[PDB]
Amino acid sequence: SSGLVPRGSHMQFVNKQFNYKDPVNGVDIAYIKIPMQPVKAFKIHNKIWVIPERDTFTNPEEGDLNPPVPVSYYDSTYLSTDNEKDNYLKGVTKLFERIYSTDLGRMLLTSIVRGIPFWGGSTIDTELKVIDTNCINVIQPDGSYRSEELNLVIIGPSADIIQFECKSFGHEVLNLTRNGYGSTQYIRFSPDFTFGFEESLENPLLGAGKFATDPAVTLAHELIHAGHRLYGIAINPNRVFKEVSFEELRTFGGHDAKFIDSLQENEFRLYYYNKFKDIASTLNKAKSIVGASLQYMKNVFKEKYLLSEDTSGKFSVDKLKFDKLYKMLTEIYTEDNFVKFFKVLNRKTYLNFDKAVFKINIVPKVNYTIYDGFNLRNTNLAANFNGQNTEINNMNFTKLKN
Ligand SMILES: O=C(/C=C/c1ccc(Cl)cc1Cl)NO
Ligand SMILES: [Zn+2]
């Protein structure tokens, strides 16, 4: 019926088949508070939680869901009911399993899980310490709570329902997404809507068709930004063509990313190489830790950053391992490469989308599968990306008014 386990006995990334109504347990279902009344959240994997709520939490200005760019869509009512929250959670779950079904997705999600935000929180130069906004408070059934570090939170969108994004809490002094440290990433995302694009496929009287973006591709896109931002190698959003940012071109990948000139790219690579050397020096100068042995935590970050260690125990950045990690996160993890792996239809450049928004339901296996998306094998929808064609597969896409 839902199709969460097409091969084997159990899901391979997501740890449980949650229902929204499952009681809180303080372990993988808990009321949590972000650095607000608590919100029910689900731990889908080590370091990754899902909050099936509209994001009225992360940005203080954006506390309401009413209307005050090309395409936007508002419904204050979306994701207000337990049934919707259940369907959100199962849809996100399904999309994670779809991403993890690919070699590329397994590489990306591993990198994300391993990309623990750096403990650069001390004003004492020789002391390691967590940064408080890289945690959440996990309330237990008896009301006690513990702070838990995490890497990624998937949350529902704020007022603009199709405004998907990867954001995070800043430091008053540190630029965490651009200094190698990284920070917990919050992805505003809905599996219940998608957007359109036009494509002309190839009998002769077929003009341009109207297709829908596969929401596994959209989520992977945001997961790719999360990877850059967790290893603190995001491109400054003030770097743009004008509009499309360098960071978006990089993340879309394919030919779009080739418009970032190689001289520019060499410059960023060197910049972040030096930021990683700074992290190795800081770890080396560390003498104490607050809030696990110092030796243990240093090693956590040697593991994250692929640091080399001599017989003294001194760390250094290896140039070949740095290049590997940097190339993985920035060149190999791209929307274009996920498109190739999924074998789905996608727009051919970042800006080439329609001002068309659709309600979808990906949870029923009769609508969308982990292996095929909307393009269900052994049906009319396997041919010519007909499952993503909003005319042919009209039952799966309800066009919304912009
Ligand atoms: O790139 C984005 C969002 C992109 C986006 C959001 C909404 C629509 Cl309709 C189309 C697009 Cl390409 N977030 O990282
Ligand atoms: Zn993006």
User: Please, are residues 106 and 119 in contact by the beta-carbon 8 Å criterion?
Assistant: no
Other beta carbons less than 10 A from residue 383's beta carbon: 11
Ligand 1 atom nearest to CA at 195: 9
CA–centroid distance, residue 377 to ligand 1 (Å): 28
Greatest Cα pair distance, the chain, in angstroms, is 73
Resolution in A: 1.9
How buried is 151 (Cβ within 10 angstroms: 0-12 exposed, 13-18 middle, 19+ buried)?
Answer: buried
Q: Tokens 């029923």 map to which residue?
A: 364
How far apart are the C-alpha atoms of 315 and 279, rounded to whole Å? 9
Residue 17 lies in a domain: no
Q: Tokens 């996100």 map to which residue?
A: 92
Residue of 72, 161, 195, 336 with the most ligand 1 atoms within 8 Å of its CB, for mutation: 195
Is any ligand 1 atom within 6 A of the Cβ of residue 188?
A: no
Helices 82-100 & 103-114, crossing angle to 10 degrees?
A: 110
Is any ligand 1 atom within 6 A of the Cβ of residue 354?
A: no
User: Which 3 state secondary structure label does DSSP give 373?
Assistant: strand
How buried is 256 (Cβ within 10 angstroms: 0-12 exposed, 13-18 middle, 19+ buried)?
Answer: buried
CA–centroid distance, residue 297 to ligand 2 (Å): 32
Question: Per the structure block, which two tokens stand in for 102?
Answer: 């690919």
Residue 370 lies in a domain: yes
How buried is 240 (Cβ within 10 angstroms: 0-12 exposed, 13-18 middle, 19+ buried)?
Answer: middle
CATH code of the domain containing 34: 3.90.1240.10
Is any ligand 1 atom within 6 A of the Cβ of residue 244?
A: no
DSSP H or E segment with residue 51: strand 48-54
End-to-end Cα, the chain, rounded Å: 32
Sequence-distant (6+) residues with CB within 8 A of 216 are 95, 98, 99, 338, 342, 344, 373
How far apart are the C-alpha atoms of 258 and 295, rounded to whole Å? 42
How far apart are the C-alpha atoms of 98 and 19, rounded to whole Å? 19
User: Please, are residues 290 and 297 in contact by the beta-carbon 8 Å criterion?
Assistant: no
Identify the DSSP state of 331.
Answer: I
Alpha-helical segments (H) within 242-344:
246-252, 262-285, 294-305, 319-327, 335-342
Residue 10 lies in a domain: no
CA–centroid distance, residue 154 to ligand 2 (Å): 15
How buried is 21 (Cβ within 10 angstroms: 0-12 exposed, 13-18 middle, 19+ buried)?
Answer: exposed
User: Please, are residues 13 and 97 in contact by the beta-carbon 8 Å criterion?
Assistant: yes
How far apart are the C-alpha atoms of 323 and 225, rounded to whole Å? 18
Instruction: Tell me how many degrees the CA angle 332-334-338 measures, rounded to the nearest 5.
Output: 100
Closest Cα to atom 13, ligand 1: which residue?
165
Domain range for residue 54? 27-402
- Looking at 122-204, which runs of residues are DSSP E strands? 127-128, 135-139, 145-149, 152-156, 165-167, 185-188, 193-199
Instruction: Please give the tally of structural domains in the chain.
Output: 1
How far apart are the C-alpha atoms of 317 and 349, rounded to whole Å? 35
How far apart are the C-alpha atoms of 233 and 397, rounded to whole Å? 37
Is any ligand 1 atom within 6 A of the Cβ of residue 226?
A: no
- Looking at 134-192, which runs of residues are DSSP E strands? 135-139, 145-149, 152-156, 165-167, 185-188
User: Please, are residues 368 and 378 in contact by the beta-carbon 8 Å criterion?
Assistant: no
User: Please, are residues 95 and 4 in contact by the beta-carbon 8 Å criterion?
Assistant: no
Question: Per the structure block, which two tokens stand in for 120?
Answer: 């650069």
Alpha-helical segments (H) within 101-172:
103-114
- How do strand 185-188 and strand 152-156 relate by DSSP bridges? parallel
Residue 190 lies in a domain: yes
Catalytic-residue membership of 222: yes
Closest Cα to atom 14, ligand 1: which residue?
165
For ligand 2, an ion, list residues with CB under 5 A: 248
How far apart are the C-alpha atoms of 240 and 259, rounded to whole Å? 11
Sequence-distant (6+) residues with CB within 8 A of 251 are 221, 224, 225, 228, 334, 335
User: Please, are residues 15 and 44 in contact by the beta-carbon 8 Å criterion?
Assistant: yes
User: Please, are residues 393 and 374 in contact by the beta-carbon 8 Å criterion?
Assistant: yes
Catalytic hit among 97, 222, 265, 335: 222
Question: Per the structure block, which two tokens stand in for 222?
Answer: 């945001």
